[PDB]
PDB file of C-alpha atoms and ligand atoms in Angstrom:
ATOM      1  CA  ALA O   1      -4.969 -14.163  10.730  1.00 21.70           C
ATOM      2  CA  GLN O   2      -8.164 -12.193  12.126  1.00 21.28           C
ATOM      3  CA  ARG O   3     -11.281 -11.195  10.665  1.00 24.39           C
ATOM      4  CA  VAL O   4     -13.506  -8.560  12.296  1.00 24.06           C
ATOM      5  CA  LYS O   5     -16.095  -6.348  12.060  1.00 26.77           C
ATOM      6  CA  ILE O   6     -14.957  -2.810  12.419  1.00 27.81           C
ATOM      7  CA  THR O   7     -16.786   0.462  12.813  1.00 31.32           C
ATOM      8  CA  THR O   8     -15.766   2.852   9.947  1.00 32.82           C
ATOM      9  CA  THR O   9     -16.887   6.441   9.426  1.00 34.20           C
ATOM     10  CA  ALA O  10     -17.187   5.742   5.869  1.00 33.83           C
ATOM     11  CA  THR O  11     -20.077   4.180   4.116  1.00 32.97           C
ATOM     12  CA  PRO O  12     -21.560   1.678   5.135  1.00 32.25           C
ATOM     13  CA  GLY O  13     -20.053   2.052   8.499  1.00 32.13           C
ATOM     14  CA  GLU O  14     -19.263  -1.337   9.313  1.00 34.46           C
ATOM     15  CA  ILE O  15     -16.872  -3.610   7.518  1.00 36.03           C
ATOM     16  CA  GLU O  16     -15.621  -6.871   7.901  1.00 37.40           C
ATOM     17  CA  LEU O  17     -11.684  -6.572   7.580  1.00 35.30           C
ATOM     18  CA  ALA O  18      -9.247  -9.662   7.619  1.00 36.43           C
ATOM     19  CA  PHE O  19      -5.923  -8.720   8.996  1.00 36.72           C
ATOM     20  CA  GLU O  20      -2.548 -10.041  10.687  1.00 34.03           C
ATOM     21  CA  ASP O  21      -1.471  -8.679  13.852  1.00 34.67           C
ATOM     22  CA  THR O  22       1.909  -9.837  14.778  1.00 37.77           C
ATOM     23  CA  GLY O  23       4.542  -8.714  17.848  1.00 36.25           C
ATOM     24  CA  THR O  24       4.406  -6.126  20.624  1.00 34.75           C
ATOM     25  CA  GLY O  25       5.630  -2.716  20.647  1.00 33.11           C
ATOM     26  CA  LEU O  26       5.305   0.251  18.337  1.00 34.95           C
ATOM     27  CA  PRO O  27       2.645  -0.345  16.166  1.00 33.58           C
ATOM     28  CA  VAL O  28       3.499  -0.493  12.447  1.00 29.64           C
ATOM     29  CA  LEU O  29       0.407  -0.782  10.149  1.00 29.18           C
ATOM     30  CA  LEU O  30       1.302  -1.870   6.711  1.00 30.47           C
ATOM     31  CA  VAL O  31      -0.971  -1.225   3.703  1.00 33.53           C
ATOM     32  CA  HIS O  32      -0.608  -3.058   0.222  1.00 32.59           C
ATOM     33  CA  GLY O  33      -0.898  -2.079  -3.252  1.00 28.36           C
ATOM     34  CA  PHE O  34      -3.488  -2.599  -6.235  1.00 27.21           C
ATOM     35  CA  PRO O  35      -4.893  -5.181  -6.503  1.00 26.59           C
ATOM     36  CA  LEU O  36      -2.824  -7.193  -4.047  1.00 25.80           C
ATOM     37  CA  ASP O  37      -3.607  -8.260  -0.493  1.00 22.85           C
ATOM     38  CA  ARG O  38      -1.890  -8.509   2.982  1.00 21.51           C
ATOM     39  CA  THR O  39       0.482 -11.269   1.899  1.00 23.99           C
ATOM     40  CA  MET O  40       2.398  -8.451  -0.140  1.00 27.40           C
ATOM     41  CA  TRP O  41       4.397  -7.670   3.029  1.00 26.95           C
ATOM     42  CA  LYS O  42       4.444 -11.257   4.570  1.00 23.81           C
ATOM     43  CA  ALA O  43       8.443 -10.846   4.727  1.00 20.67           C
ATOM     44  CA  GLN O  44       8.080  -7.735   6.680  1.00 19.21           C
ATOM     45  CA  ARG O  45       5.665  -8.676   9.072  1.00 23.19           C
ATOM     46  CA  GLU O  46       7.281 -12.234   9.933  1.00 22.30           C
ATOM     47  CA  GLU O  47      10.689 -10.330  10.218  1.00 24.41           C
ATOM     48  CA  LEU O  48      10.017  -6.740  12.063  1.00 27.22           C
ATOM     49  CA  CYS O  49       7.914  -8.493  14.617  1.00 23.70           C
ATOM     50  CA  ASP O  50      10.613  -9.277  16.944  1.00 24.52           C
ATOM     51  CA  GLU O  51      10.965  -5.589  17.402  1.00 26.12           C
ATOM     52  CA  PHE O  52       7.707  -4.002  16.662  1.00 25.97           C
ATOM     53  CA  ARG O  53       3.910  -4.895  16.516  1.00 27.88           C
ATOM     54  CA  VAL O  54       3.019  -5.254  12.993  1.00 29.03           C
ATOM     55  CA  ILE O  55      -0.548  -4.885  11.979  1.00 29.89           C
ATOM     56  CA  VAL O  56      -1.217  -5.569   7.978  1.00 30.73           C
ATOM     57  CA  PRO O  57      -4.974  -5.634   7.056  1.00 27.57           C
ATOM     58  CA  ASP O  58      -6.625  -6.838   3.573  1.00 30.14           C
ATOM     59  CA  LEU O  59      -8.178  -3.591   2.355  1.00 28.60           C
ATOM     60  CA  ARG O  60     -11.972  -3.286   1.960  1.00 29.46           C
ATOM     61  CA  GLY O  61     -12.651  -5.499  -1.587  1.00 25.97           C
ATOM     62  CA  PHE O  62      -9.151  -7.369  -1.515  1.00 24.16           C
ATOM     63  CA  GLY O  63      -7.947 -10.330   0.169  1.00 23.01           C
ATOM     64  CA  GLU O  64     -10.522 -11.705   2.664  1.00 19.35           C
ATOM     65  CA  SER O  65     -12.003  -8.709   3.757  1.00 22.51           C
ATOM     66  CA  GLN O  66     -15.576  -7.833   3.198  1.00 20.71           C
ATOM     67  CA  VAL O  67     -16.259  -6.396  -0.563  1.00 23.54           C
ATOM     68  CA  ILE O  68     -18.422  -3.139  -0.433  1.00 25.87           C
ATOM     69  CA  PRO O  69     -19.373  -2.784  -4.470  1.00 30.72           C
ATOM     70  CA  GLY O  70     -19.474   1.045  -5.928  1.00 29.56           C
ATOM     71  CA  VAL O  71     -16.490   2.966  -5.086  1.00 30.15           C
ATOM     72  CA  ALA O  72     -13.809   2.463  -2.412  1.00 30.50           C
ATOM     73  CA  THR O  73     -12.509   5.890  -1.912  1.00 28.96           C
ATOM     74  CA  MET O  74      -8.898   6.499  -0.593  1.00 25.42           C
ATOM     75  CA  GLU O  75     -10.544   8.577   2.253  1.00 21.18           C
ATOM     76  CA  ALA O  76     -13.114   5.169   2.817  1.00 22.24           C
ATOM     77  CA  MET O  77      -9.996   2.947   3.197  1.00 19.68           C
ATOM     78  CA  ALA O  78      -8.389   5.258   5.531  1.00 17.30           C
ATOM     79  CA  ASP O  79     -11.333   5.444   7.670  1.00 16.52           C
ATOM     80  CA  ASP O  80     -11.456   1.742   7.660  1.00 13.80           C
ATOM     81  CA  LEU O  81      -7.728   1.982   9.077  1.00 17.31           C
ATOM     82  CA  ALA O  82      -8.641   4.443  11.685  1.00 16.78           C
ATOM     83  CA  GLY O  83     -11.709   1.960  12.608  1.00 15.38           C
ATOM     84  CA  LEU O  84      -9.391  -1.019  13.018  1.00 13.18           C
ATOM     85  CA  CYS O  85      -7.080   1.009  15.241  1.00 15.10           C
ATOM     86  CA  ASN O  86      -9.819   1.716  17.283  1.00 15.30           C
ATOM     87  CA  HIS O  87     -11.312  -1.901  17.393  1.00 17.30           C
ATOM     88  CA  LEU O  88      -7.562  -2.930  18.536  1.00 19.42           C
ATOM     89  CA  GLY O  89      -7.429  -0.376  21.191  1.00 18.72           C
ATOM     90  CA  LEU O  90      -4.609   1.431  19.253  1.00 19.68           C
ATOM     91  CA  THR O  91      -6.072   4.936  19.841  1.00 18.54           C
ATOM     92  CA  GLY O  92      -2.867   6.816  20.133  1.00 18.72           C
ATOM     93  CA  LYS O  93      -0.015   7.088  17.362  1.00 15.19           C
ATOM     94  CA  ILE O  94       1.088   4.405  15.062  1.00 18.31           C
ATOM     95  CA  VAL O  95       3.336   4.389  12.115  1.00 15.33           C
ATOM     96  CA  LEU O  96       1.470   3.972   8.585  1.00 14.25           C
ATOM     97  CA  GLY O  97       3.150   2.249   5.643  1.00 13.68           C
ATOM     98  CA  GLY O  98       1.878   2.057   2.342  1.00 13.76           C
ATOM     99  CA  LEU O  99       2.902   0.861  -1.049  1.00 11.02           C
ATOM    100  CA  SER O 100       1.591   2.420  -4.304  1.00 10.99           C
ATOM    101  CA  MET O 101      -2.429   2.493  -3.799  1.00  7.46           C
ATOM    102  CA  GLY O 102      -1.309   1.871  -0.185  1.00  6.44           C
ATOM    103  CA  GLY O 103       0.629   5.189  -0.233  1.00  7.93           C
ATOM    104  CA  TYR O 104      -2.456   7.053  -1.496  1.00  9.38           C
ATOM    105  CA  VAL O 105      -4.339   5.410   1.173  1.00 11.52           C
ATOM    106  CA  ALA O 106      -1.626   6.646   3.694  1.00 12.46           C
ATOM    107  CA  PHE O 107      -1.823  10.252   2.300  1.00 12.69           C
ATOM    108  CA  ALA O 108      -5.840  10.118   2.930  1.00 11.21           C
ATOM    109  CA  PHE O 109      -4.821   8.931   6.680  1.00 11.86           C
ATOM    110  CA  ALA O 110      -2.268  11.604   7.132  1.00 11.94           C
ATOM    111  CA  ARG O 111      -5.132  13.975   5.751  1.00 13.21           C
ATOM    112  CA  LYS O 112      -7.761  13.041   8.338  1.00 14.34           C
ATOM    113  CA  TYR O 113      -5.802  11.469  11.615  1.00 13.35           C
ATOM    114  CA  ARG O 114      -2.837  13.902  11.528  1.00 15.14           C
ATOM    115  CA  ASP O 115      -2.785  13.179  15.229  1.00 13.15           C
ATOM    116  CA  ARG O 116      -2.878   9.438  14.933  1.00 13.32           C
ATOM    117  CA  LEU O 117       0.955   9.233  13.041  1.00 13.53           C
ATOM    118  CA  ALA O 118       4.008   8.949  14.739  1.00 13.48           C
ATOM    119  CA  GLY O 119       5.702   8.275  11.216  1.00 12.63           C
ATOM    120  CA  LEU O 120       4.851   7.781   7.668  1.00 13.37           C
ATOM    121  CA  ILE O 121       6.431   4.972   5.324  1.00 13.03           C
ATOM    122  CA  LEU O 122       5.785   5.937   1.599  1.00 13.59           C
ATOM    123  CA  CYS O 123       7.028   2.898  -1.050  1.00 15.69           C
ATOM    124  CA  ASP O 124       6.616   3.325  -4.416  1.00 16.23           C
ATOM    125  CA  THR O 125       3.794   5.824  -4.567  1.00 14.98           C
ATOM    126  CA  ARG O 126       2.997   9.385  -5.851  1.00 13.48           C
ATOM    127  CA  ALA O 127       0.902  12.347  -4.181  1.00 10.60           C
ATOM    128  CA  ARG O 128      -0.486  13.478  -7.505  1.00  5.37           C
ATOM    129  CA  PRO O 129      -4.187  12.594  -8.625  1.00  6.08           C
ATOM    130  CA  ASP O 130      -4.735  10.669 -11.962  1.00  4.86           C
ATOM    131  CA  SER O 131      -4.753  12.687 -15.080  1.00  6.93           C
ATOM    132  CA  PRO O 132      -7.722  12.698 -17.133  1.00  7.55           C
ATOM    133  CA  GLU O 133      -6.822   9.845 -19.033  1.00  7.71           C
ATOM    134  CA  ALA O 134      -5.421   8.003 -16.457  1.00  5.41           C
ATOM    135  CA  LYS O 135      -9.048   8.502 -14.658  1.00  5.94           C
ATOM    136  CA  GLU O 136     -10.711   7.207 -17.612  1.00  5.47           C
ATOM    137  CA  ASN O 137      -8.720   4.171 -17.725  1.00  2.97           C
ATOM    138  CA  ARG O 138      -9.615   3.229 -13.944  1.00  5.70           C
ATOM    139  CA  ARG O 139     -13.290   3.642 -15.466  1.00  6.16           C
ATOM    140  CA  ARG O 140     -12.519   1.007 -18.348  1.00  8.39           C
ATOM    141  CA  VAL O 141     -10.918  -1.262 -16.009  1.00  8.87           C
ATOM    142  CA  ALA O 142     -13.558  -1.218 -13.305  1.00 10.23           C
ATOM    143  CA  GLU O 143     -15.953  -1.934 -15.993  1.00 15.30           C
ATOM    144  CA  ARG O 144     -14.382  -5.113 -17.536  1.00 14.49           C
ATOM    145  CA  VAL O 145     -12.781  -6.524 -14.235  1.00 14.75           C
ATOM    146  CA  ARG O 146     -16.519  -6.999 -13.086  1.00 16.58           C
ATOM    147  CA  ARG O 147     -17.582  -9.092 -16.090  1.00 14.36           C
ATOM    148  CA  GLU O 148     -13.739 -10.637 -17.141  1.00 14.50           C
ATOM    149  CA  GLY O 149     -12.127 -10.934 -13.937  1.00 14.87           C
ATOM    150  CA  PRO O 150      -8.585  -9.691 -13.171  1.00 16.07           C
ATOM    151  CA  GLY O 151      -6.546 -11.593 -15.711  1.00 14.62           C
ATOM    152  CA  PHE O 152      -6.202  -8.965 -18.280  1.00 10.96           C
ATOM    153  CA  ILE O 153      -4.791  -6.817 -15.282  1.00 10.39           C
ATOM    154  CA  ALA O 154      -2.295  -9.489 -14.183  1.00  9.86           C
ATOM    155  CA  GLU O 155      -1.060  -9.489 -18.046  1.00  9.49           C
ATOM    156  CA  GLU O 156      -0.576  -5.802 -17.884  1.00  7.29           C
ATOM    157  CA  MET O 157       0.767  -5.162 -15.034  1.00  6.34           C
ATOM    158  CA  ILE O 158       2.932  -7.957 -14.132  1.00  6.31           C
ATOM    159  CA  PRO O 159       5.583  -6.908 -16.698  1.00  6.94           C
ATOM    160  CA  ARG O 160       5.662  -3.569 -15.020  1.00  9.37           C
ATOM    161  CA  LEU O 161       5.695  -4.510 -11.566  1.00  8.72           C
ATOM    162  CA  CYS O 162       9.075  -6.339 -10.949  1.00  8.09           C
ATOM    163  CA  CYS O 163      12.270  -5.748 -12.653  1.00 11.58           C
ATOM    164  CA  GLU O 164      14.361  -8.222 -14.841  1.00 11.33           C
ATOM    165  CA  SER O 165      16.413  -9.486 -11.898  1.00  8.92           C
ATOM    166  CA  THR O 166      13.265 -10.483 -10.051  1.00  8.43           C
ATOM    167  CA  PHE O 167      11.848 -12.496 -13.252  1.00  9.48           C
ATOM    168  CA  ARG O 168      15.482 -14.366 -13.335  1.00  8.52           C
ATOM    169  CA  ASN O 169      16.448 -15.174 -10.020  1.00  9.07           C
ATOM    170  CA  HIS O 170      12.573 -15.187  -8.163  1.00  7.26           C
ATOM    171  CA  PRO O 171      10.071 -16.776 -10.900  1.00  8.69           C
ATOM    172  CA  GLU O 172       8.153 -17.836  -7.043  1.00  6.70           C
ATOM    173  CA  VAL O 173       7.489 -14.580  -6.590  1.00  6.34           C
ATOM    174  CA  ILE O 174       6.398 -13.451  -9.742  1.00  7.90           C
ATOM    175  CA  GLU O 175       4.084 -16.219  -9.355  1.00  2.66           C
ATOM    176  CA  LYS O 176       2.930 -15.365  -5.677  1.00  2.00           C
ATOM    177  CA  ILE O 177       2.264 -12.015  -7.210  1.00  2.00           C
ATOM    178  CA  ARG O 178       0.468 -12.878 -10.331  1.00  2.00           C
ATOM    179  CA  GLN O 179      -1.896 -15.462  -7.488  1.00  2.00           C
ATOM    180  CA  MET O 180      -2.710 -12.135  -5.805  1.00  2.00           C
ATOM    181  CA  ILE O 181      -3.858 -10.112  -8.875  1.00  2.00           C
ATOM    182  CA  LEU O 182      -5.572 -13.490  -9.998  1.00  2.00           C
ATOM    183  CA  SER O 183      -7.404 -13.897  -6.674  1.00  2.00           C
ATOM    184  CA  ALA O 184      -8.658 -10.326  -6.310  1.00  2.00           C
ATOM    185  CA  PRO O 185     -12.191  -9.750  -5.894  1.00  2.00           C
ATOM    186  CA  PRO O 186     -13.748  -8.290  -9.420  1.00  2.00           C
ATOM    187  CA  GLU O 187     -15.969  -6.031  -7.590  1.00  2.00           C
ATOM    188  CA  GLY O 188     -13.205  -5.020  -5.236  1.00  2.00           C
ATOM    189  CA  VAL O 189     -10.531  -4.084  -7.760  1.00  2.00           C
ATOM    190  CA  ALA O 190     -13.416  -2.290  -9.859  1.00  2.00           C
ATOM    191  CA  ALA O 191     -14.416  -0.394  -6.719  1.00  2.00           C
ATOM    192  CA  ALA O 192     -10.642   0.682  -6.002  1.00  2.00           C
ATOM    193  CA  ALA O 193     -10.104   1.324  -9.430  1.00  2.00           C
ATOM    194  CA  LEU O 194     -12.971   3.971  -9.143  1.00  2.00           C
ATOM    195  CA  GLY O 195     -11.817   5.254  -5.914  1.00  2.00           C
ATOM    196  CA  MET O 196      -7.908   5.695  -7.376  1.00  2.00           C
ATOM    197  CA  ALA O 197      -9.532   7.775 -10.437  1.00  2.00           C
ATOM    198  CA  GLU O 198     -11.510  10.157  -7.593  1.00  2.00           C
ATOM    199  CA  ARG O 199      -8.739  10.604  -5.192  1.00  2.00           C
ATOM    200  CA  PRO O 200      -7.564  14.143  -4.526  1.00  2.00           C
ATOM    201  CA  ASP O 201      -4.002  15.771  -5.826  1.00  2.00           C
ATOM    202  CA  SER O 202      -1.988  15.313  -2.192  1.00  2.00           C
ATOM    203  CA  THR O 203       0.936  17.724  -3.431  1.00  2.00           C
ATOM    204  CA  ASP O 204      -0.015  20.225  -1.154  1.00  2.00           C
ATOM    205  CA  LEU O 205      -0.299  18.146   1.535  1.00  2.00           C
ATOM    206  CA  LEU O 206       3.445  16.973   1.870  1.00  2.00           C
ATOM    207  CA  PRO O 207       4.923  20.073   2.927  1.00  2.00           C
ATOM    208  CA  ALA O 208       2.248  20.291   5.848  1.00  2.33           C
ATOM    209  CA  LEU O 209       3.398  16.915   7.143  1.00  2.00           C
ATOM    210  CA  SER O 210       4.096  16.907  10.839  1.00  2.00           C
ATOM    211  CA  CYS O 211       5.754  13.088  11.258  1.00  2.38           C
ATOM    212  CA  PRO O 212       9.300  11.877  10.086  1.00  3.67           C
ATOM    213  CA  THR O 213       8.774  10.076   6.509  1.00  2.46           C
ATOM    214  CA  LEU O 214      10.538   7.148   4.927  1.00  2.00           C
ATOM    215  CA  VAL O 215      10.293   7.062   1.468  1.00  2.31           C
ATOM    216  CA  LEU O 216      11.275   3.977  -0.466  1.00  2.00           C
ATOM    217  CA  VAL O 217      11.676   2.941  -3.961  1.00  2.00           C
ATOM    218  CA  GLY O 218      12.967   0.249  -6.246  1.00  2.00           C
ATOM    219  CA  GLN O 219      15.844   1.233  -8.393  1.00  2.00           C
ATOM    220  CA  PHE O 220      14.104  -0.061 -11.424  1.00  2.00           C
ATOM    221  CA  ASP O 221      10.074   0.678 -10.614  1.00  2.00           C
ATOM    222  CA  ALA O 222       8.483   1.428 -13.944  1.00  2.00           C
ATOM    223  CA  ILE O 223       5.370   2.567 -12.192  1.00  2.82           C
ATOM    224  CA  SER O 224       6.551   5.461  -9.748  1.00  2.51           C
ATOM    225  CA  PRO O 225      10.031   6.024 -10.906  1.00  2.29           C
ATOM    226  CA  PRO O 226      12.937   6.384  -8.477  1.00  5.19           C
ATOM    227  CA  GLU O 227      13.581  10.172 -10.097  1.00  3.74           C
ATOM    228  CA  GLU O 228       9.919  11.096  -9.435  1.00  7.53           C
ATOM    229  CA  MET O 229      10.241   9.834  -5.876  1.00  8.71           C
ATOM    230  CA  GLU O 230      13.123  11.564  -4.942  1.00  8.17           C
ATOM    231  CA  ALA O 231      11.732  14.755  -6.131  1.00  9.49           C
ATOM    232  CA  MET O 232       8.698  14.066  -3.971  1.00  5.35           C
ATOM    233  CA  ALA O 233      10.752  13.113  -1.062  1.00  6.52           C
ATOM    234  CA  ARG O 234      12.285  16.538  -1.242  1.00  8.24           C
ATOM    235  CA  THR O 235       8.997  18.191  -0.643  1.00  8.43           C
ATOM    236  CA  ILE O 236       8.671  16.088   2.702  1.00 10.62           C
ATOM    237  CA  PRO O 237       9.962  17.717   6.073  1.00 10.30           C
ATOM    238  CA  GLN O 238      11.903  15.166   8.053  1.00 12.66           C
ATOM    239  CA  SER O 239      12.203  12.968   5.303  1.00 13.22           C
ATOM    240  CA  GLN O 240      14.759   9.809   4.194  1.00 13.78           C
ATOM    241  CA  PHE O 241      14.875   8.395   0.831  1.00 14.45           C
ATOM    242  CA  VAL O 242      16.201   5.150   0.410  1.00 12.00           C
ATOM    243  CA  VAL O 243      16.255   3.636  -3.148  1.00 12.27           C
ATOM    244  CA  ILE O 244      16.085  -0.241  -2.909  1.00 10.41           C
ATOM    245  CA  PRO O 245      18.652  -1.899  -5.494  1.00  8.47           C
ATOM    246  CA  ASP O 246      17.614  -4.691  -8.121  1.00  8.10           C
ATOM    247  CA  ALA O 247      13.882  -3.934  -7.161  1.00  7.38           C
ATOM    248  CA  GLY O 248      11.084  -2.489  -9.740  1.00  6.21           C
ATOM    249  CA  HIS O 249       7.867  -1.702  -8.241  1.00  7.29           C
ATOM    250  CA  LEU O 250       7.154  -4.094  -5.510  1.00  7.79           C
ATOM    251  CA  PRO O 251      10.538  -4.096  -3.542  1.00  5.95           C
ATOM    252  CA  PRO O 252       9.101  -5.632  -0.202  1.00  8.53           C
ATOM    253  CA  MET O 253       8.457  -8.837  -2.353  1.00 12.50           C
ATOM    254  CA  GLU O 254      11.522  -8.422  -4.853  1.00 14.58           C
ATOM    255  CA  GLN O 255      14.333  -7.577  -2.191  1.00 17.38           C
ATOM    256  CA  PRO O 256      12.651  -8.453   1.152  1.00 18.68           C
ATOM    257  CA  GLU O 257      15.728  -7.986   3.463  1.00 19.79           C
ATOM    258  CA  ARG O 258      16.714  -4.862   1.988  1.00 24.83           C
ATOM    259  CA  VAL O 259      13.361  -3.349   2.469  1.00 25.05           C
ATOM    260  CA  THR O 260      12.893  -5.122   6.168  1.00 25.76           C
ATOM    261  CA  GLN O 261      16.557  -3.405   7.225  1.00 28.37           C
ATOM    262  CA  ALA O 262      15.701  -0.189   5.628  1.00 26.06           C
ATOM    263  CA  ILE O 263      12.565  -0.055   7.539  1.00 27.32           C
ATOM    264  CA  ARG O 264      13.600  -1.602  10.696  1.00 25.88           C
ATOM    265  CA  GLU O 265      16.579   0.984  11.276  1.00 27.10           C
ATOM    266  CA  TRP O 266      14.622   3.917  10.336  1.00 26.96           C
ATOM    267  CA  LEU O 267      11.730   2.500  12.754  1.00 26.93           C
ATOM    268  CA  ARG O 268      14.544   2.246  15.635  1.00 26.29           C
ATOM    269  CA  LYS O 269      14.563   6.400  15.542  1.00 27.63           C
ATOM    270  CA  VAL O 270      11.372   7.135  15.603  1.00 27.73           C
ATOM    271  CA  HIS O 271      11.020   4.235  18.186  1.00 30.52           C
ATOM    272  CA  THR O 272      14.005   5.954  20.654  1.00 30.36           C
TER     273      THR O 272
HETATM  274 CL1   CL T   1      -5.043   9.967  -1.535  1.00 26.04          CL
HETATM  275 CL1   CL T   2      -2.010   9.679 -14.243  1.00 26.60          CL
END
């Protein structure tokens, strides 16, 4: 992995991002969920790099990246991604993928950096903003995580993140996810929670998209259910919708081979 100071149009103008960059060819940048880190996408990075260039950053405030206290808007996160691609000399088009919060970042990127997208991969996410109660709950999470750390978040989220089959067959995957949460920087988690609260409604962005889009969801996703994701996909032109069996909210970790395959086969067409 690498750690580089990049120039970003978001405050504070410069930020240090940690990231993986593996393979050659078409660039595919994959964005993790909340409150996880780049290792969420490790199986896909390690497998897809035989055919594509896979770039996987820790977002601001997560993993090994710089923590910028206050609010980390989805726009700011997207600006950082643009600045990373600029740093790397990927100044043309990329495929951008994101899971959950990372999908919110992808929407912010598509808003602002349309002409940099060859394609979008939207996993286990939604285009609607937070409801008023959801916003308030973000503020409560932010306030508490700054003081107590993310243990309470792991306790609340783990049962909602993965399906029953994962708990049974892959307890090691559960534990990897738990350690990602437990290790997340408290002020980075707070800043992202506040950023999620403030994110705009992307509903009307979707019909205006101009690149092919893959929409992927776990069969048993409790957080962004498949029914709602299918409806979201029907608003996106040039979309493909895939349900990953025997996965909850984290298909890349729960069913890594099936996710890698779905992405690989879709990328081949974007690419050809
Ligand atoms: Cl957003
Ligand atoms: Cl909501």
